[PDB]
Design a protein around this motif. Structure first.
Motif, PDB file in Angstrom:
ATOM      1  N   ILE A 114      58.924  64.113  50.439  1.00  0.00           N
ATOM      2  CA  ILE A 114      57.648  64.252  49.748  1.00  0.00           C
ATOM      3  C   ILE A 114      56.742  65.217  50.504  1.00  0.00           C
ATOM      4  O   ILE A 114      56.483  65.032  51.689  1.00  0.00           O
ATOM      5  CB  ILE A 114      56.890  62.887  49.695  1.00  0.00           C
ATOM      6  CG1 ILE A 114      57.648  61.873  48.839  1.00  0.00           C
ATOM      7  CG2 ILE A 114      55.405  63.015  49.223  1.00  0.00           C
ATOM      8  CD1 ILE A 114      57.607  62.158  47.378  1.00  0.00           C
ATOM      9  N   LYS A 115      56.274  66.248  49.813  1.00  0.00           N
ATOM     10  CA  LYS A 115      55.269  67.167  50.357  1.00  0.00           C
ATOM     11  C   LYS A 115      53.906  66.609  49.949  1.00  0.00           C
ATOM     12  O   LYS A 115      53.561  66.607  48.771  1.00  0.00           O
ATOM     13  CB  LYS A 115      55.476  68.585  49.827  1.00  0.00           C
ATOM     14  CG  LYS A 115      54.521  69.549  50.427  1.00  0.00           C
ATOM     15  CD  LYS A 115      54.762  70.938  49.944  1.00  0.00           C
ATOM     16  CE  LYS A 115      53.744  71.906  50.508  1.00  0.00           C
ATOM     17  NZ  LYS A 115      53.924  73.264  49.885  1.00  0.00           N
ATOM     18  N   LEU A 116      53.170  66.097  50.937  1.00  0.00           N
ATOM     19  CA  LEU A 116      51.896  65.431  50.765  1.00  0.00           C
ATOM     20  C   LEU A 116      50.781  66.305  51.273  1.00  0.00           C
ATOM     21  O   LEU A 116      50.756  66.668  52.444  1.00  0.00           O
ATOM     22  CB  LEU A 116      51.899  64.101  51.533  1.00  0.00           C
ATOM     23  CG  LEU A 116      50.586  63.317  51.619  1.00  0.00           C
ATOM     24  CD1 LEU A 116      50.143  62.922  50.197  1.00  0.00           C
ATOM     25  CD2 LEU A 116      50.697  62.080  52.536  1.00  0.00           C
ATOM     26  N   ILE A 117      49.888  66.700  50.378  1.00  0.00           N
ATOM     27  CA  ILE A 117      48.756  67.493  50.755  1.00  0.00           C
ATOM     28  C   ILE A 117      47.605  66.642  51.244  1.00  0.00           C
ATOM     29  O   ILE A 117      47.416  65.500  50.825  1.00  0.00           O
ATOM     30  CB  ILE A 117      48.265  68.371  49.564  1.00  0.00           C
ATOM     31  CG1 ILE A 117      49.448  69.044  48.864  1.00  0.00           C
ATOM     32  CG2 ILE A 117      47.214  69.383  50.002  1.00  0.00           C
ATOM     33  CD1 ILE A 117      50.328  69.892  49.774  1.00  0.00           C
ATOM     34  N   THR A 118      46.824  67.211  52.157  1.00  0.00           N
ATOM     35  CA  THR A 118      45.612  66.554  52.637  1.00  0.00           C
ATOM     36  C   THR A 118      44.590  67.628  52.957  1.00  0.00           C
ATOM     37  O   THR A 118      44.899  68.832  52.927  1.00  0.00           O
ATOM     38  CB  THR A 118      45.874  65.602  53.792  1.00  0.00           C
ATOM     39  OG1 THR A 118      44.719  64.779  54.043  1.00  0.00           O
ATOM     40  CG2 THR A 118      46.292  66.360  55.062  1.00  0.00           C
ATOM     41  N   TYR A 119      43.371  67.198  53.239  1.00  0.00           N
ATOM     42  CA  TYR A 119      42.269  68.081  53.575  1.00  0.00           C
ATOM     43  C   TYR A 119      41.312  67.344  54.479  1.00  0.00           C
ATOM     44  O   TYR A 119      41.265  66.112  54.449  1.00  0.00           O
ATOM     45  CB  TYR A 119      41.603  68.642  52.307  1.00  0.00           C
ATOM     46  CG  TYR A 119      41.069  67.645  51.283  1.00  0.00           C
ATOM     47  CD1 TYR A 119      39.703  67.414  51.160  1.00  0.00           C
ATOM     48  CD2 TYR A 119      41.905  66.937  50.454  1.00  0.00           C
ATOM     49  CE1 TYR A 119      39.217  66.532  50.221  1.00  0.00           C
ATOM     50  CE2 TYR A 119      41.415  66.041  49.535  1.00  0.00           C
ATOM     51  CZ  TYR A 119      40.086  65.812  49.442  1.00  0.00           C
ATOM     52  OH  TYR A 119      39.605  64.914  48.482  1.00  0.00           O
ATOM     53  N   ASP A 120      40.542  68.076  55.269  1.00  0.00           N
ATOM     54  CA  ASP A 120      39.649  67.468  56.262  1.00  0.00           C
ATOM     55  C   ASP A 120      38.288  66.953  55.758  1.00  0.00           C
ATOM     56  O   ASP A 120      37.690  66.070  56.382  1.00  0.00           O
ATOM     57  CB  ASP A 120      39.373  68.486  57.378  1.00  0.00           C
ATOM     58  CG  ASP A 120      40.498  68.597  58.384  1.00  0.00           C
ATOM     59  OD1 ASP A 120      41.198  67.602  58.660  1.00  0.00           O
ATOM     60  OD2 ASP A 120      40.664  69.705  58.931  1.00  0.00           O
ATOM     61  N   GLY A 121      37.820  67.486  54.645  1.00  0.00           N
ATOM     62  CA  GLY A 121      36.429  67.227  54.203  1.00  0.00           C
ATOM     63  C   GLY A 121      35.993  65.777  54.189  1.00  0.00           C
ATOM     64  O   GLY A 121      34.898  65.437  54.616  1.00  0.00           O
ATOM     65  N   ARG A 122      36.870  64.933  53.676  1.00  0.00           N
ATOM     66  CA  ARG A 122      36.667  63.496  53.671  1.00  0.00           C
ATOM     67  C   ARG A 122      37.489  63.081  54.902  1.00  0.00           C
ATOM     68  O   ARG A 122      38.722  63.060  54.846  1.00  0.00           O
ATOM     69  CB  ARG A 122      37.189  62.857  52.397  1.00  0.00           C
ATOM     70  CG  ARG A 122      36.703  63.471  51.097  1.00  0.00           C
ATOM     71  CD  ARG A 122      35.245  63.261  50.859  1.00  0.00           C
ATOM     72  NE  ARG A 122      34.856  63.773  49.554  1.00  0.00           N
ATOM     73  CZ  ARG A 122      33.603  63.883  49.136  1.00  0.00           C
ATOM     74  NH1 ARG A 122      32.602  63.484  49.909  1.00  0.00           N
ATOM     75  NH2 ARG A 122      33.340  64.385  47.962  1.00  0.00           N
ATOM     76  N   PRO A 123      36.821  62.740  56.004  1.00  0.00           N
ATOM     77  CA  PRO A 123      37.593  62.625  57.259  1.00  0.00           C
ATOM     78  C   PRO A 123      38.683  61.604  57.359  1.00  0.00           C
ATOM     79  O   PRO A 123      39.587  61.753  58.209  1.00  0.00           O
ATOM     80  CB  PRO A 123      36.512  62.363  58.320  1.00  0.00           C
ATOM     81  CG  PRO A 123      35.270  62.782  57.738  1.00  0.00           C
ATOM     82  CD  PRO A 123      35.373  62.635  56.241  1.00  0.00           C
ATOM     83  N   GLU A 124      38.615  60.563  56.564  1.00  0.00           N
ATOM     84  CA  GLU A 124      39.650  59.530  56.669  1.00  0.00           C
ATOM     85  C   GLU A 124      40.937  59.861  55.933  1.00  0.00           C
ATOM     86  O   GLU A 124      41.967  59.244  56.211  1.00  0.00           O
ATOM     87  CB  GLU A 124      39.109  58.170  56.263  1.00  0.00           C
ATOM     88  CG  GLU A 124      38.189  57.553  57.322  1.00  0.00           C
ATOM     89  CD  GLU A 124      36.802  58.179  57.417  1.00  0.00           C
ATOM     90  OE1 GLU A 124      36.137  58.328  56.363  1.00  0.00           O
ATOM     91  OE2 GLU A 124      36.352  58.455  58.552  1.00  0.00           O
ATOM     92  N   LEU A 125      40.901  60.805  54.998  1.00  0.00           N
ATOM     93  CA  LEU A 125      42.091  61.093  54.205  1.00  0.00           C
ATOM     94  C   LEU A 125      43.312  61.502  55.054  1.00  0.00           C
ATOM     95  O   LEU A 125      44.425  60.997  54.832  1.00  0.00           O
ATOM     96  CB  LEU A 125      41.818  62.144  53.139  1.00  0.00           C
ATOM     97  CG  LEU A 125      40.811  61.742  52.068  1.00  0.00           C
ATOM     98  CD1 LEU A 125      40.674  62.931  51.118  1.00  0.00           C
ATOM     99  CD2 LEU A 125      41.195  60.462  51.282  1.00  0.00           C
TER     100      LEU A 125
END
Ligand SMILES: N[C@@H](Cc1c[nH]c[nH+]1)C(=O)O
Ligand SMILES: N[C@@H](Cc1c[nH]c[nH+]1)C(=O)O
Ligand code: NI
Length: 465
Positions: free
Chosen positions: A310-321
């Protein structure tokens, strides 16, 4: 002068109000209606409205409102703004099934082909904020609104410079200038506040709250809100079958995430909507069960010798993600799922490439104006603006379409619960946590908003002692 520096996550490209809620957040633009501190819809730019029948909305605009460039806010300006926003944004288009708009003086008449009880509510959405369509400047760069602070300079994806609009309709704004800079890393936003580079920041990482509370020069606000973190599946990839989504749902430890990642500033989620809302009938809480996930993955032939990738994307803006992504990766390995985490700097842009991801961490304001319809139309209908993974089920569509024309508020609640129950079976997304709103500021900053919808921040009363 009284100048305010703000550090926000979630950098924008276009700053047109129909592209982002930032203009409403920072005090540049305003919608016709707005929610009050208790979450109820109220007139803002509107003096009076009437609904003589269920397909007609008659609005009389206030007569003392100017845009930042001195042009008068009239019904013709509202008509042109709404029509432009509808044509340029699918979010706006799908939320506003308007068949016609007539304008004369301060009077606007909006018609629909069928009853759409949520029309007024959606005219409070910040994406529907009013701007001057006749302004000669590019609306994507320097939109002209009616808010207390006019956007004077925009450095795309980096910084917004605003100045006091002295003739603002509600009062003379209290600050001289505002400078908004984007910073995706929450730890950097906190450092900026601590070094006085910035005076006000949003989306404070939970792991920094105590430090801010300790500092008498800073203040932190933590409030119950209507934002939900989730794992969003890409339904356009054939491998993301119901069994795979169910397996992933059982790998998530919602309890542990709420307690240790959110340090208690969140509650475990079931549906998209905060369980504190009393009419919502939530699906049963999923407890982590690695063995059950392994069994479900076996249904598609995934084993240790041949695991699911699974290629799971994330981002920093919402710090807990991204912290949640790390835990999911570790726990998923126990179930024969190899998750690759890819952190991206522009999440909305990235997800447009349907071939570039299998699932993504995500966060959304699921019930900003007291009704669940908005979320269903934007997230569970094909081409809805947050349905990045293209979930769609004809049986669910039928209920959503029924809900959209349902007048009786009680019946709306029932149909909404029917949608929750039916859609939950498909695991369109896995809702993880209902998380609190955490905002921090220098103690010198007063009267910024930290209300449950999480949209508003700056208004004409915001000031620096
Ligand atoms: N809806 C997501 C992604 C986003 C980026 N910009 C605006 N939204 C969030 O608010 O976290
Ligand atoms: N950032 C806001 C608004 C939004 C629209 N699209 C993506 N985000 C939210 O997540 O609630
Ligand atoms: Ni968003």
């Amino acid at each position: 002068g009284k100048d305010l520096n703000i550090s926000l996550p979630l950098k924008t490209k276009s700053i047109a109000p129909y592209e982002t809620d930032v203009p409403v957040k920072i005090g540049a633009a305003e919608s016709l209606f707005k929610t009050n501190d208790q979450g109820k819809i109220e007139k803002a730019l509107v003096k009076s409205y009437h609904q003589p029948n269920d397909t007609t909305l008659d609005i009389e605009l206030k007569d003392n409102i100017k845009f930042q460039n001195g042009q008068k806010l009239t019904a013709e300006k509202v008509k042109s703004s709404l029509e432009n926003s509808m044509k340029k944004s699918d979010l706006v288009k799908y939320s506003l099934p308007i068949s016609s708009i007539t304008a004369k003086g301060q009077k606007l008449t909006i018609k629909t082909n069928s009853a759409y009880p949520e029309l007024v509510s959606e005219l409070a959405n910040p994406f529907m904020a009013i701007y001057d369509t006749d302004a000669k400047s590019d609306v994507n760069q320097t939109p002209v609104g009616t808010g207390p602070y006019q956007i004077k300079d925009y450095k795309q994806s980096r910084k917004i410079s605003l100045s006091n609009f002295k003739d603002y309709w509600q009062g003379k704004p209290k600050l001289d200038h505002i400078t908004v800079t984007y910073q995706e890393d929450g730890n950097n936003r906190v450092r900026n506040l601590e070094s006085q580079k910035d005076d006000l920041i949003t989306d404070v990482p939970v792991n920094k709250v105590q430090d801010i509370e300790n500092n008498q020069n800073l203040k932190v606000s933590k409030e119950s809100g209507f934002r939900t973190s989730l794992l969003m599946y890409n339904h356009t990839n054939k491998k993301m079958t119901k069994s795979v989504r169910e397996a992933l749902d059982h790998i998530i430890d919602r309890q542990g995430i709420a307690d240790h990642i959110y340090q208690g500033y969140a509650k475990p989620a079931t549906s998209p909507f905060n369980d504190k809302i009393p009419y919502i009938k939530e699906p049963k809480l999923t407890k982590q069960n690695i063995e059950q996930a392994k069994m479900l993955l076996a249904k598609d032939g995934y084993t240790k010798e041949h695991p699911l990738k699974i290629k799971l994307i994330t981002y920093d803006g919402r710090p807990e993600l991204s912290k949640i992504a790390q835990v999911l990766q570790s726990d998923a390995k126990k179930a024969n799922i190899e998750i690759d985490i890819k952190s991206v700097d522009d999440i909305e842009g990235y997800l447009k490439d349907r071939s570039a991801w299998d699932a993504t961490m995500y966060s959304f304001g699921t019930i900003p104006r007291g009704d669940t319809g908005y979320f269903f139309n934007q997230a569970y209908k094909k081409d809805g603006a947050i349905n990045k993974g293209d979930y769609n089920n004809s049986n669910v569509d039928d209920l959503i379409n029924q809900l959209n024309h349902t007048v009786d508020v009680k019946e709306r609640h029932n149909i909404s619960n029917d949608i929750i129950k039916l859609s939950s079976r498909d695991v369109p997304n896995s809702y993880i946590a209902y998380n609190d709103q955490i905002v921090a500021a220098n103690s010198k900053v007063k009267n910024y908003k930290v209300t449950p919808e999480g949209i508003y921040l700056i208004d004409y009363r915001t000031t620096i002692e």
